[PDB]
Design a protein around this ligand. Structure first.
Ligand SMILES: [Mg+2]
Ligand SMILES: [Mg+2]
Ligand SMILES: [Mg+2]
Ligand SMILES: [Mg+2]
Ligand SMILES: [Mg+2]
Ligand SMILES: [Mg+2]
Ligand SMILES: [Mg+2]
Ligand SMILES: [Mg+2]
Ligand SMILES: [Mg+2]
Ligand SMILES: [Mg+2]
Ligand SMILES: [Mg+2]
Ligand SMILES: [Mg+2]
Ligand SMILES: [Mg+2]
Ligand SMILES: [Mg+2]
Ligand SMILES: [Mg+2]
Ligand SMILES: [Mg+2]
Ligand SMILES: [Mg+2]
Ligand SMILES: [Mg+2]
Ligand SMILES: [Mg+2]
Ligand SMILES: [Mg+2]
Ligand SMILES: [Mg+2]
Ligand SMILES: [Mg+2]
Ligand SMILES: [Mg+2]
Ligand SMILES: [Mg+2]
Ligand SMILES: [Mg+2]
Ligand SMILES: [Mg+2]
Ligand SMILES: [Mg+2]
Ligand SMILES: [Mg+2]
Ligand SMILES: [Mg+2]
Ligand SMILES: [Mg+2]
Ligand SMILES: [Mg+2]
Ligand SMILES: [Mg+2]
Ligand SMILES: [Mg+2]
Ligand SMILES: [Mg+2]
Ligand SMILES: [Mg+2]
Ligand SMILES: [Mg+2]
Ligand SMILES: [Mg+2]
Ligand SMILES: [Mg+2]
Ligand SMILES: [Mg+2]
Ligand SMILES: [Mg+2]
Ligand SMILES: [Mg+2]
Ligand SMILES: [Mg+2]
Ligand SMILES: [Mg+2]
Ligand SMILES: [Mg+2]
Ligand SMILES: [Mg+2]
Ligand SMILES: [Mg+2]
Ligand SMILES: [Mg+2]
Ligand SMILES: [Mg+2]
Ligand SMILES: [Mg+2]
Ligand SMILES: [Mg+2]
Ligand SMILES: [Mg+2]
Ligand SMILES: [Mg+2]
Ligand SMILES: [Mg+2]
Ligand SMILES: [Mg+2]
Ligand SMILES: [Mg+2]
Ligand SMILES: [Mg+2]
Ligand SMILES: [Mg+2]
Ligand SMILES: [Mg+2]
Ligand SMILES: [Mg+2]
Ligand SMILES: [Mg+2]
Ligand SMILES: [Mg+2]
Ligand SMILES: [Mg+2]
Ligand SMILES: [Mg+2]
Ligand SMILES: [Mg+2]
Ligand SMILES: [Mg+2]
Ligand SMILES: [Mg+2]
Ligand SMILES: [Mg+2]
Ligand SMILES: [Mg+2]
Ligand SMILES: [Mg+2]
Ligand SMILES: [Mg+2]
Ligand SMILES: [Mg+2]
Ligand SMILES: [Mg+2]
Ligand SMILES: [Mg+2]
Ligand SMILES: [Mg+2]
Ligand SMILES: [Mg+2]
Ligand SMILES: [Mg+2]
Ligand SMILES: [Mg+2]
Ligand SMILES: [Mg+2]
Ligand SMILES: [Mg+2]
Ligand SMILES: [Mg+2]
Ligand SMILES: [Mg+2]
Ligand SMILES: [Mg+2]
Ligand SMILES: [Mg+2]
Ligand SMILES: [Mg+2]
Ligand SMILES: [Mg+2]
Ligand SMILES: [Mg+2]
Ligand SMILES: [Mg+2]
Ligand SMILES: [Mg+2]
Ligand SMILES: [Mg+2]
Ligand SMILES: [Mg+2]
Ligand SMILES: [Mg+2]
Ligand SMILES: [Mg+2]
Lengths: 48, 170, 136, 96, 98
RNA sequence: GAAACUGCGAAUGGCUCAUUAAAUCAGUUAUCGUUUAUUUGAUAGUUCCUUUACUACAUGGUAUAACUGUGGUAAUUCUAGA
RNA sequence: UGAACAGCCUCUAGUUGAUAGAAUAAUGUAGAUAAGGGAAGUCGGCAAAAUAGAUCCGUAACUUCGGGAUAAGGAUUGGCU
RNA sequence: CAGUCAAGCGUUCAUAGCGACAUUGCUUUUUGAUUCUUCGAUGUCGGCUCUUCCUAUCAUACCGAAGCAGAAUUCGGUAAG
RNA sequence: GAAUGUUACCGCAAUAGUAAUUGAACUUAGUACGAGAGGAACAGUUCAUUCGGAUAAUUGGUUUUUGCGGCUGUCUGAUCAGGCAUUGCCGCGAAGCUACCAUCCGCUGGAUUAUGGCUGAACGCCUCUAAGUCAGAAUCCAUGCUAGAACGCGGUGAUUUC
RNA sequence: UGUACAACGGGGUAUUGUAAGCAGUAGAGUAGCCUUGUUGUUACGAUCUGCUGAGAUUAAGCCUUUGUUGUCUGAUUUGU
């Protein structure tokens, strides 16, 4: 769908930005439920 | 941050301490003199209305009504002015000062109760403290009792007992 | 970077390639700083080394006290101009490229830095935090 | 309050002011993944479980957002909600 | 997370947004976008640029309800008397006459 | 009689000789060309109001320090709210 | 308009002739812009950028005293009244 | 460019690291020697650009040895990822 | 892209390609070693370099959005609103494209080499080697990733009547 | 022949920076008629102010839609 910005406290003991705010970019994937409609079975063969 | 609450009807005052950023956040961007409905600050202060009167940020600099700005500034202060007592006749000084806009950079808010809620606050509503001194000028006595320029003061002036041990004085 | 820089540095946009000239910001007699190298830079066929805020370069003084001219000396970039971005997400830039002459250990040569300094430089060399007016 | 936080609180979804550009609105569940992803807007994507257990510490870090920008992406958006915009701007020649 | 404001146009500068400029005298100028930032670099005077806060404030535009009355007062009247001088005998002798 | 207010003083004293060459300085003028705390001597019956149903004169107003009490800062002859 | 037979716009007159249609890949030819640095590019600043009119102020070495000189360096410029 | 013998060098100690007098080789980015191919024409140097290959390895991985205390270094192995 | 009945969907995987690199700081630790002067490393953390694949929330660049505004010259009587100056010039400028000038991600198993060893004869002793065997490298084979043989393959859907 | 598709229209989101028109006791000022002004009057004057964050553009690869109008069987070929 798109991208946006996010702010959060970073939890990285030892880093100059431990317990500090960062802004990070994030994508957003639209994700409505998949509907199940079949099962498929696979067998192992010497050709794969 | 630390709230510094004053009950000026009782002369009472006591500091409370508030954690949790959402409870505080009610004061943010509120100016000095803006009233705040209490329940947002707690359930103990339900209904209580607090007028924002001042206070100090970290590093201890005072606020100063009228500046706006949720920042610090450095101003030229004069006699008869806040956050400055001059040392010398007609002396001005350039001193830092914190802005009248509340921020999380504050160590201490200063609040003044205006309307009392539905519940009592301990060291505040429950206790009451006496006005140290009483009237000294003539007409102020006649107006702290209502007497008309007939009643003669002398016996209406206050009288404070204090003891030598076995000699109690007046 | 390197010697006597206690600390790491998060990468920031490279604004000063070699041959750039930046205001000498201390009070030693030097007036500007001409970058001939970057310390700890890497190799790529045809890439100019470049300095960023808090880097340690090698400079020569182009305009300044004669007893300071015509010779190499370390220096620390204290102000950029090429806007970089911090991890709190701000894109910020100074008004001028500037640096202060220092020794390999990272102690300064003069006794003050005139103008502001970036924190990512003052956080990196103590003796710069010593002589820093306003930081960032 | 899809796009609200423990620290944001305000009722608002992830859809930016005037909606995801070249896309739409997001009216269903969604995955918000850090960074950028191969492929472009409207394209079928496959999110796949990892193939190894990463002790990265960088992966492992439990994260909680503070704030999710919901300003319009169609320009240099200045406002999160239409509420917020009206607050700052005032009443206009349309309007009340 | 502080939502700064544009030191030219007076808009909110939500996190990670716009530019920050650190002038010579060490004064910081936060711009929300390139528009204000270029207008700033142009020596343009925000009080002459119609769409800015600083212009609107100065020209008293749309303010209306802030110059409208409110209601924030109280009513006290409680007595304490004087410390060291019996707060009791300060309401009985305080029976007054006119 | 602490503190604090108020008043006066801190513009004298002491130090140096860098600038300064018609400047300073000096001797001699000028203020019919001006300011002057102080000291000393003088100097003030008039203040209200369409002018009988009068205006506190037997004396009109508050707002502050010190102080009490709640506080902030690593830090100053910092000072905030009550 | 402007110093002008310059450039740019117009009246008179005269043209509207030069295969056409659809797209706007790479690479080109011709026209442009680019943060920060600023010749580090290259045999070489090649190419490009910079400068530019006019009114005023200011102008070095050296010289065959004629120059060098728009030396260099500055400021100013609309409209309306 | 690499060996073999080992008189010597290396405080002592031939061979840790070296190595004379001799002697055996390898290589074909040296230069020669030759004149086979092209003189009815195989575009001459360098640079830019870009790929790939060799190893007689400069760095990086893991090792053996030292006249390797540590630190640094030298000799060597597997190694051209 | 013709032809292996037509057409469609979902897949297998032969062969081929393949990828990551290097450094510093903290800490270890002023430690082991040393008369001293000097002076490490393995584990852990934080970053960086060279490389690679993406990506465009942000910031930057680009501007025929000829979008809004502005300016010069002229032409439409003036007004409004416009034409022309090979896109007339200037400020701003969304969308798109795009930058270590921007952000994000860059997998872990086995088998070996050198080398150090185990057991152990040949050779009643001894020997890592002869038989057998352990541990081992930026190597190699996999895992992973990119093609998918247009003459390698499977599963499944529907399959025409005037 | 329908949570259909399209063209417009509406709403959102953007960009610029306040449209035209009208008004004004704003305006350096300037004319013209006297009944020569205890604002004389009628106009004119770059610009300013008000209605006006107005107007204008906004998918051409933005978002959205209970409205309006319209469209919905042409062609070719394929079998174990
Ligand atoms: Mg760090
Ligand atoms: Mg080169
Ligand atoms: Mg920059
Ligand atoms: Mg110091
Ligand atoms: Mg400081
Ligand atoms: Mg759509
Ligand atoms: Mg965008
Ligand atoms: Mg966009
Ligand atoms: Mg832009
Ligand atoms: Mg005094
Ligand atoms: Mg004196
Ligand atoms: Mg008062
Ligand atoms: Mg002409
Ligand atoms: Mg032709
Ligand atoms: Mg054509
Ligand atoms: Mg082209
Ligand atoms: Mg450039
Ligand atoms: Mg530039
Ligand atoms: Mg330059
Ligand atoms: Mg060169
Ligand atoms: Mg040069
Ligand atoms: Mg060259
Ligand atoms: Mg030459
Ligand atoms: Mg050369
Ligand atoms: Mg030549
Ligand atoms: Mg040149
Ligand atoms: Mg050339
Ligand atoms: Mg040229
Ligand atoms: Mg230019
Ligand atoms: Mg010359
Ligand atoms: Mg010039
Ligand atoms: Mg003028
Ligand atoms: Mg011999
Ligand atoms: Mg020996
Ligand atoms: Mg010997
Ligand atoms: Mg030998
Ligand atoms: Mg031999
Ligand atoms: Mg041979
Ligand atoms: Mg040969
Ligand atoms: Mg050779
Ligand atoms: Mg030959
Ligand atoms: Mg031939
Ligand atoms: Mg030929
Ligand atoms: Mg050829
Ligand atoms: Mg030829
Ligand atoms: Mg020995
Ligand atoms: Mg040793
Ligand atoms: Mg050493
Ligand atoms: Mg070995
Ligand atoms: Mg070996
Ligand atoms: Mg290789
Ligand atoms: Mg090979
Ligand atoms: Mg240590
Ligand atoms: Mg030591
Ligand atoms: Mg020793
Ligand atoms: Mg990507
Ligand atoms: Mg442009
Ligand atoms: Mg235009
Ligand atoms: Mg008009
Ligand atoms: Mg024409
Ligand atoms: Mg022409
Ligand atoms: Mg053109
Ligand atoms: Mg212009
Ligand atoms: Mg853009
Ligand atoms: Mg493009
Ligand atoms: Mg980066
Ligand atoms: Mg990259
Ligand atoms: Mg990584
Ligand atoms: Mg992988
Ligand atoms: Mg794996
Ligand atoms: Mg294997
Ligand atoms: Mg074994
Ligand atoms: Mg054994
Ligand atoms: Mg034997
Ligand atoms: Mg073995
Ligand atoms: Mg064996
Ligand atoms: Mg054997
Ligand atoms: Mg590897
Ligand atoms: Mg794969
Ligand atoms: Mg095949
Ligand atoms: Mg084929
Ligand atoms: Mg196939
Ligand atoms: Mg097969
Ligand atoms: Mg098949
Ligand atoms: Mg089949
Ligand atoms: Mg239609
Ligand atoms: Mg208008
Ligand atoms: Mg109208
Ligand atoms: Mg307006
Ligand atoms: Mg296209
Ligand atoms: Mg409608
Ligand atoms: Mg048939």
């Amino acid at each position: 769908a798109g991208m946006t910005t996010i702010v959060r406290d970073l939890d990285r003991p030892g880093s100059k930005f431990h317990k500090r705010e960062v802004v990070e970019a994030v994508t957003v994937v639209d994700t409505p439920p998949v509907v199940v409609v079949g099962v498929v079975g696979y067998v192992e063969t010497p050709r794969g | 941050m630390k709230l510094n609450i004053s009950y000026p009807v009782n002369g009472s005052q006591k500091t409370f301490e508030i954690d949790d950023e959402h409870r505080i956040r009610v004061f943010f961007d509120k100016r000095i003199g803006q009233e705040v409905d209490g329940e947002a600050v707690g359930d103990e202060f339900k209904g209580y209305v607090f007028k924002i009167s001042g206070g100090n940020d970290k590093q201890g600099f005072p606020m100063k009504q009228g500046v706006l700005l949720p920042t610090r500034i450095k101003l030229l202060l004069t006699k008869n002015v806040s956050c400055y007592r001059p040392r010398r006749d007609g002396e001005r000084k350039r001193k830092s000062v914190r802005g009248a806009i509340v921020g999380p950079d504050l160590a201490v808010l200063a609040l003044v109760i205006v309307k009392k809620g539905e519940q009592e606050l301990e060291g505040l509503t429950d206790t009451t403290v006496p006005k140290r001194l009483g009237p000294k000028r003539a007409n102020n006595i006649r107006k702290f009792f209502g007497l008309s320029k007939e009643d003669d003061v002398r016996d209406f002036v206050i009288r404070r007992e204090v003891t030598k041990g076995e000699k109690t004085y007046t | 970077s390197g010697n006597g820089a206690q600390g790491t540095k998060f990468r920031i946009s490279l604004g000063l390639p070699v041959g750039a000239i930046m205001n000498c910001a201390d009070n030693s007699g030097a007036r500007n700083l001409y970058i001939i190298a970057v310390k700890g830079s890497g190799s790529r066929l045809n890439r100019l080394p470049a300095a960023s805020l808090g880097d340690m370069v090698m400079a020569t003084v182009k305009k300044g006290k004669p007893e300071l001219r015509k010779k190499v000396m370390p220096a620390i970039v204290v102000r950029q101009a090429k806007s970089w971005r911090r991890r709190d997400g701000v894109f910020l830039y100074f008004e001028d490229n500037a640096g202060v002459i220092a020794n390999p250990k990272g102690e300064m040569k003069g006794s003050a830095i005139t103008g502001p300094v970036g924190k990512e430089c003052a956080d990196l060399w103590p003796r710069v935090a010593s002589n820093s007016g306003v930081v960032v | 309050a899809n796009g609200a936080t423990s620290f944001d609180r305000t009722k608002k979804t992830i859809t930016p002011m005037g909606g995801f550009v070249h896309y739409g609105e997001i009216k269903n569940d969604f995955i918000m993944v850090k960074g950028c992803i191969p492929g472009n807007r409207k394209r079928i994507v496959t999110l796949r479980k990892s193939l190894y257990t990463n002790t990265s510490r960088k992966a492992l870090e439990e994260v909680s957002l503070k704030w999710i920008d919901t300003a319009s992406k169609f320009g240099k958006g200045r406002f999160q909600t239409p509420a917020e915009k009206h607050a700052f701007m005032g009443t206009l020649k349309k309007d009340l | 997370m502080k939502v700064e404001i544009d030191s030219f146009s007076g808009a909110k500068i939500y996190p990670g947004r716009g530019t920050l400029f650190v002038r010579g005298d060490s004064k910081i100028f936060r711009f929300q976008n390139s528009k204000s930032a270029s207008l700033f670099k142009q020596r343009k005077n925000p009080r002459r640029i119609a769409w800015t806060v600083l212009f609107r404030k100065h020209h008293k535009k749309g303010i209306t309800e802030e110059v409208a009355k409110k209601r924030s007062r109280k009513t006290v009247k409680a007595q304490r008397p004087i410390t060291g001088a019996s707060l009791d005998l300060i309401k009985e002798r305080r029976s007054l006459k006119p």
